[PDB]
């Protein structure tokens, strides 16, 4: 890698970048590319998992919290539960009763409730000083090797590229994690590019790269308070304390007209691969929340937004508000048995992201649904 505190993506296992990277245009070179067989994708996926796992090693396990919780809703609303439980203190012969708020999605019923992963694995809390904000990562070639770049403006992903340049290394790629919509990536320069391994299959996803960004404004309106609970000898647990003010739902705002222009353009270019059929967009069909919603890390909180307000239309020859849920116990990269607890972040959260692309899947009139939780399709 090459790069340019304690960020989760900056473990410093890799060197600093060259301030003035070179690029050499190779005249008269035709090179056959195939983005679906590219092994830089597997390399990135593996490195991303390792940076994450290394970063979570040096911190507190929440094994001691797998106790029965007594959860009520006595003082929150007229999805968030007020739970009491017994914990040990730094002395092994002493216990105390404490209170914390938990989101309903992190707690399951069985002295009424249990944390969702206590019968599966140990939950590690995120190390509290570690930021999850993405840092561009450059991938650079070793001696004896070269990285070739395709400069064709209309290149979809496969076949000959008629403008090939040699680079010392790649542009910085931000390890942004998302599902249905691709955020903060690169834009197409001339038109929306629709690319897939096989545009006529149903088993393959379609990556749609936009040439214009659409802003999405997301927020977490509840003024959460962080509370620090001592679990052990130098081991602190970060709990949500009382909510100050109103209890409000997290949400994302997408302009109505920008989204509609984006779809008119996506459909126009989709009818270039499909015959002149009616095209319909539907919400995803079901399954785990990580698949059915648009997930992202905003300010360090993990959002799961409902996109049925976007993918609900029929195409033939104001502001959109998406409600969102927040979870503290998560299982990234579809790895079962390795949950992580995201400590609450004090204060209100707001972030503005750029939708730069979509991940669509064809159902068995053509039907398209958003989706694909396999991170390699983002990279």
């Amino acid at each position: 890698c090459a790069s340019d505190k304690r960020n989760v993506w900056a473990t410093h296992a890799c060197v600093p970048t060259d301030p003035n990277p070179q690029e050499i245009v190779l005249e008269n070179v035709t090179e056959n590319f195939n983005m679906w067989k590219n092994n830089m994708v597997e390399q990135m996926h593996t490195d991303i998992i390792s940076l994450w796992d290394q970063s979570l090693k040096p911190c507190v396990k929440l094994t001691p919290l797998c106790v029965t919780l007594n959860c009520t809703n006595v003082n929150v609303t007229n999805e968030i539960k007020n739970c009491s439980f017994n914990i040990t203190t730094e002395l092994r012969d002493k216990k105390k009763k404490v209170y914390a708020l938990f989101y309903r999605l992190d707690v399951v019923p069985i002295s009424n409730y249990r944390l969702i992963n206590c019968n599966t694995s140990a939950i590690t809390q995120a190390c509290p000083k570690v930021s999850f904000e993405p840092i561009p990562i450059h991938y650079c070639a070793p001696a004896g090797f070269a990285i070739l770049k395709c400069n064709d403006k209309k290149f979809n992903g496969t076949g000959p590229c008629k403008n090939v340049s040699t680079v010392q290394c790649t542009h910085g790629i931000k390890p942004v994690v998302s599902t249905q919509l691709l955020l903060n990536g690169s834009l197409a320069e001339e038109e929306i590019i629709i690319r897939s391994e096989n545009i006529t299959n149903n088993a393959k996803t379609i990556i749609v790269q936009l040439n214009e960004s659409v802003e999405i404004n997301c927020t977490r309106p509840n003024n959460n308070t962080r509370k620090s609970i001592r679990i052990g000898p130098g081991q602190w647990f970060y709990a949500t304390g009382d909510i100050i003010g109103d209890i409000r739902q997290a949400h994302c705002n997408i302009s109505g007209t920008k989204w509609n222009k984006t779809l008119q353009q996506v459909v126009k270019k989709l009818r270039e691969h499909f015959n002149n059929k009616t095209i319909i967009f539907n919400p995803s069909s079901g399954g785990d929340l990580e698949i059915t919603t648009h997930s992202f890390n905003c300010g360090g909180e993990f959002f799961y937004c409902n996109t049925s307000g976007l993918f609900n239309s029929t195409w033939i020859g104001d502001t959109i508000t998406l409600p969102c849920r927040i979870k503290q116990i998560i299982n990234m990269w579809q790895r079962v048995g390795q949950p992580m607890y995201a400590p609450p972040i004090q204060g209100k959260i707001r972030c503005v992201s750029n939708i730069t692309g979509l991940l669509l899947t064809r159902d068995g009139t053509e039907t398209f649904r958003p989706g694909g939780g396999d991170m390699r399709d983002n990279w």
Epitope: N78, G245, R248, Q249, H251, T321
Partner: antibody, heavy 131, light 108 residues
Framework: QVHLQESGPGLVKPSETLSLTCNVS????????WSWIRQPLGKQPEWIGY???????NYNPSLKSRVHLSLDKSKNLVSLRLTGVTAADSAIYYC??????????????????????????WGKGTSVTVS | APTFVSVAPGQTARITCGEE??????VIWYQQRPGQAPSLIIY??????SGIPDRFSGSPGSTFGTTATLTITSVEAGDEADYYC????????????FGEGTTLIVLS
């Protein structure tokens, strides 16, 4: 000017039905919300419930099974039927018009708001003793 | 149950109610002359109905952690009345009972 006049028996027996009537003048019953309020002597007033057309009626939970409120459109009267009266019901009762509005704190689409009620026009009331 | 304050005529009175605000609120204030039905002074924290002077105002419903407050400036002999306060709050259940009042005693 709306005028609300009130009457009742004055004296009601224990474990008996109390029926109070509010004579509405200057406005029609069908066009507003009505509330009943009572004030035990020496105490802060209690909101019994409120009644309106379109089924928009609700009651103080402690009186959920004791109070029936109704509106007589033809006689333009507002009334209260309280059953099973006890010593605790020995209060001055009032008839009042009610107005309402909405307090919005968040996204209206997510129903992050509530309806509040207030009483602008009050009658003189009637004193009821349960013996 | 009641609280008392004593203000010389021409002085400002301060009357408060309830518990701390949890969420957005809409406080409704009433004035009760002895022997009479109460009447409305303020609805929605600071919106007074016609007939009520600008001497009556109060705290906003936008804050949390505070109590309802009614401020009566230039108190007159005509303000010797009890004061009641009905609190609506976005996190608490509907309050069917007006809170305990504060009696304003006007001197001289």
């Amino acid at each position: 000017q709306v005028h609300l006049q009130e009457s009742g028996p004055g004296l009601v027996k224990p474990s008996e039905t109390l029926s109070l009537t509010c004579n509405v003048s200057g406005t029609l019953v069908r066009d507003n919300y009505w509330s009943w309020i009572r004030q035990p002597l020496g105490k802060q007033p209690e909101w019994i419930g409120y009644v309106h057309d379109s089924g928009d009626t609700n009651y103080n939970p402690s009186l959920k099974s004791r109070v029936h409120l109704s509106l007589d459109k033809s006689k333009n009267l507002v009334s209260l039927r309280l059953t099973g009266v006890t010593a605790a019901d020995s209060a001055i009762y009032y008839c009042a018009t009610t107005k309402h509005g909405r307090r919005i704190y968040g996204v209206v689409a997510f129903k992050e708001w509530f309806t509040y009620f207030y009483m602008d026009v009050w009658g003189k009331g009637t004193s009821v003793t349960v013996s | 149950a009641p609280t008392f304050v004593s203000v010389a005529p021409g002085q400002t009175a301060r009357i408060t109610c309830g518990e701390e605000s949890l969420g957005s609120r809409s406080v409704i204030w009433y004035q009760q002359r002895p022997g009479q039905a109460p009447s409305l002074i303020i609805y929605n924290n600071n919106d007074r109905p016609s007939g009520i002077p600008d001497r009556f105002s109060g705290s906003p419903g936008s804050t949390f952690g505070t109590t309802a407050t009614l401020t009566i400036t230039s108190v007159e002999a005509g303000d010797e009345a009890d004061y009641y306060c009905h609190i609506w709050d976005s996190r608490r259940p509907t309050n069917w009972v007006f809170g305990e009042g504060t009696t304003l005693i006007v001197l001289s």
